[PDB]
Design an enzyme around this catalytic site. Sequence first.
Site, PDB file in Angstrom:
ATOM      1  N   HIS A   1       0.834  -1.166   0.000  1.00  0.00           N
ATOM      2  CA  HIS A   1       0.000   0.000   0.000  1.00  0.00           C
ATOM      3  C   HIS A   1       0.869   1.214   0.000  1.00  0.00           C
ATOM      4  CE1 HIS A   1      -3.128   2.911   1.648  1.00  0.00           C
ATOM      5  NE2 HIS A   1      -3.733   2.413   0.585  1.00  0.00           N
TER       6      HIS A   1
ATOM      7  N   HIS B   1       1.032   4.035  -3.462  1.00  0.00           N
ATOM      8  CA  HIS B   1       0.801   5.450  -3.419  1.00  0.00           C
ATOM      9  C   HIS B   1       1.998   6.160  -3.975  1.00  0.00           C
ATOM     10  CE1 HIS B   1      -3.017   5.844  -1.186  1.00  0.00           C
ATOM     11  NE2 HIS B   1      -2.681   4.719  -0.583  1.00  0.00           N
TER      12      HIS B   1
ATOM     13  N   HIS C   1      -7.964  -0.017  -4.748  1.00  0.00           N
ATOM     14  CA  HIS C   1      -8.627   0.044  -3.479  1.00  0.00           C
ATOM     15  C   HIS C   1      -9.783  -0.902  -3.461  1.00  0.00           C
ATOM     16  CE1 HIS C   1      -6.174   3.645  -3.114  1.00  0.00           C
ATOM     17  NE2 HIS C   1      -6.283   3.528  -1.802  1.00  0.00           N
TER      18      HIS C   1
ATOM     19  N   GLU D   1     -10.334  11.169  -5.110  1.00  0.00           N
ATOM     20  CA  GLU D   1      -9.230  10.889  -4.231  1.00  0.00           C
ATOM     21  C   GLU D   1      -8.953  12.000  -3.258  1.00  0.00           C
ATOM     22  OE1 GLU D   1      -5.693   9.915  -6.171  1.00  0.00           O
ATOM     23  OE2 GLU D   1      -4.499   9.519  -4.334  1.00  0.00           O
TER      24      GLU D   1
END
Lengths: 313, 313
Positions: free
Chosen positions: A170, A174, A201, A306
């Site tokens: 994760h 990003h 996600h 987002e």
Amino acid sequence: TVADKQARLMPLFKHLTALTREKLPLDQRDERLKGVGILPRGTLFSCFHARHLAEATELYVALYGAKDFNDFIHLCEQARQIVNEGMFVYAVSVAVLHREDCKGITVPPIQEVFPDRFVPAETINRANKEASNHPDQQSIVVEAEETGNILDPEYKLSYFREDIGINAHHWHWHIVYPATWNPTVMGKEKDRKGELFFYMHQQMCARYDSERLSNGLQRMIPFHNFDEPLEGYAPHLTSLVSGLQYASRPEGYSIHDLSDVDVQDMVRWRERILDAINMHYIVDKDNNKIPLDIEHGTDILGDIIESSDESKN
Amino acid sequence: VEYYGSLHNWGHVMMANITDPDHRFQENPGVMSDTSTSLRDPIFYRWHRFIDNIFQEHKKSFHPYTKEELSFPGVEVVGVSINSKTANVITTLIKESLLELSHGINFGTDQSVKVKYHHLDHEPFTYNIVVENNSGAEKHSTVRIFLAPKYDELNNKLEPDEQRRLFIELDKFFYTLTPGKNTIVRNHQDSSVTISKVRTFDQLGAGEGVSEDSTEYCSCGWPEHMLIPRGSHKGMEFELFVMLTDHDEDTVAGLSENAVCSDAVSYCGARDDRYPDKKAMGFPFDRKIEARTAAEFLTPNMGLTDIKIKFHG
């Protein structure tokens, strides 16, 4: 060689905290950072918060801007001393990933760089303790598994939630697709980042649901209502860099406005988004409408939701 | 559909399964779910008033009616009288009735199973309206009759704005007036709002000649017993409003059918035909009324007669 380049970058990141002490007698010296110089070292860095992201973006740009790899190392070396460490790791990793001088430069494993995030406080301070307890070259091994009364069935899921690999992934994802990403500056663009944001996600949730069912638990329910109280969770993570740890949350209290944002605003943003989806178009800054095309629609939505720098509004 | 949704319908659904929203307990919905049953629940009114409010806001945006729109020149309404056992008083009572179950539920051996119920009913009455036709030629007028309560929850106050909500439509019909004085008599039985008769499956077992149209046939129309409110033993005071409008304006031209289900035009409309009245439904009541008192509102082609409705125990 590129591997020698590895061996320098890894001890750049090794033990972040103690490489602070800015040690430059005049603040003005780094005019390069006169635009920023807002978030202190010890403070926790938020991947989500806008202001934090802005600083991070500013840092990356400098790294991207670096004329050559050597220049890259230099600014990085010196910048690390002054900026918050978390932001630093974030900015550097992004730079390493994109900047052409860096192929075959892996980053220091996140788990390895910040072991405290991966393992519980008890095995952090036990291990630290053993180190002090008896000085000796000998190796120390600590079994994190513990022993405790397991009151909450959520605990069953811990193998999934707590997994080291999952958390690391994760973090990395990003980094590959930063919210802050500005295509103009880099010049290159991340294809379908908004859609990917959605897909990745969604998969995490989907995979999570399969765990619950495997467990015999029902599928997770969405946090539709802002009013509802949250379930509590105590992470038991410490941040060695300071004394501080991630604050735990017990259950049972409705949602509170922050100085930065009020909950009402959150609700607004949702009704806004839903409307757009509904009328099949979103409004750009220009006040033009862009259609939620079949091809484009998920991507545009992803950026807005987002939200990324890419958001049309 | 997607932007605006379906507010009214969902309201029925949500209210209907209030008892078991989640569906876990596996219980049937309440009366709100069915068009046949929904009127029985008092909630129905609360919701419908809510929706009515939505329409009202729209109506509010429209400008009020000028004398020009309301008035029918040359025509003056001298007076109205209602004839019953006692003039200007309508009597209401409860009547027993029987319903035959046999068609609906398994009868078995029995020839018929009837259930006896009681309903409100009123004495028959007629209206006599005296109109003066000042013009040289015969005119055609649409007579509109409404009933509104005189009393409020405070004390007696004929505030026309409020009255708009309350006014109920008694009748709408076409009449031709010659020059000079004219008296138009109409019987309650003729009322455009109500269904003259619903044929029972038994009558239908034979074969009558009201004519042969369909689900509306005997069914639709408001029920006759229901035409006027119950009133009270004391004899509640109601305003009786009669207005005459220019029929030439009111009617639409076109080519439709033989005499078909048109008894009940006021609420039902006409079979396979355009609504026979140009005026907005509920006119003159639909738009905001500036005046403090209803009397002030009246034009020459309008008239108010106060009558009493008295219930008999």
